[PDB]
């Protein structure tokens, strides 16, 4: 019949963040999020002329206490008169920094001390380099990347709502910023499927407007192929697939923006295996609390955090595995 839903209580985390987004803890368990007044202009009326305005600010990056919502800004970045567009974060593991998709700058390292370097104006091709959205660590440690804008300041911002000229990213541990796919209409949440014993092998990529979440094999650090649809994600609504984020079993957990539900895919996609309905529309991050069963959700209807509990603790992320496994 239907996909079957439930719906869970969903306990108030903080507010009043435009275009809440990249929830990520770090190595102490801080809890960080990020404001995009740039996402919530996209979502508008007249969003051409307000977006256009709104890229020429800075996004922020702001830690949350956890119980009572206060929020401290950790850094607005900025680089030669450029504000920052970030949206999604990962964290390091040999260090306590955060690694931050930005649809201006393209990638960040961002300090907890708010000090950040810009990774990337070029690819390792010599292209110039896109604005990035979200990010996934492998347990190699590459960082794999979504980058829905175009060419990354000083060019104006463009994105690729409509147009297919989001790309898909690696970032190699050695350092290398290699684009690995192109042609897509406005990639969004990336996540990737490990086997038991820690070898990256399956990427998984959202496209959001058509509704597909695609997946490609992991031969190496940005060795990708055979590119596949892999889920469907339902509803004929404005948006689609956002963040997304792995539970301890491979079940992905997708944020379908402007549906009111999280998807849930099992380990082989297709159609969803259950819906998780929310109480807002508009679902856009999500972010396992490590060695619990929380998940943390950012939304864009009353520019919330929210969290709720899950069958089974998040998927270990690459910055709570240790280099030598046992140290």
Known sequence: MEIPVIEPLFTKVTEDIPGA????????????????????????????????????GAGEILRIDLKTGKKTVICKPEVNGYGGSPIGCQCDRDANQLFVADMRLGLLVVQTDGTFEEIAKKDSEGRRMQGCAYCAFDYEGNLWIT?????????????????????????????????????????????????????????????????????????????????????????????????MDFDEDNNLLVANWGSSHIEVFGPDGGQPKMRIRCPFEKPANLHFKPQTKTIFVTEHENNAVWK????????????????????
């Open 147 to 243: 980058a829905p804008a175009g060419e990354v300041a000083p060019a104006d911002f463009t994105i690729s709502l409509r147009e297919k000229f989001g790309s898909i990213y690696c970032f190699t541990t050695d350092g290398q910023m290699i684009q690995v796919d192109t042609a897509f209409q406005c990639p969004a949440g990336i996540a990737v499927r490990h086997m038991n014993d820690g070898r990256p092998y399956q990427l998984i990529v959202a496209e959001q407007p058509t509704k597909k979440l695609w997946s490609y094999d992991i031969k190496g650090p940005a060795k990708i192929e055979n590119k596949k649809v892999w889920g469907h994600i339902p509803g004929t609504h404005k948006g689609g697939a956002a963040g």
């Open 21 to 56: 987004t990249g929830p990520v803890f770090d190595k102490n368990g801080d809890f960080y999020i990020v404001a995009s007044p740039l996402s919530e202009a996209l979502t508008k009326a007249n969003s051409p002329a307000e977006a256009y305005k709104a890229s020429r």
């Open 308 to 327: 709720f509990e899950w069958q089974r603790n998040g998927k270990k992320q690459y910055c709570e595995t240790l280099k030598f496994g046992i140290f």
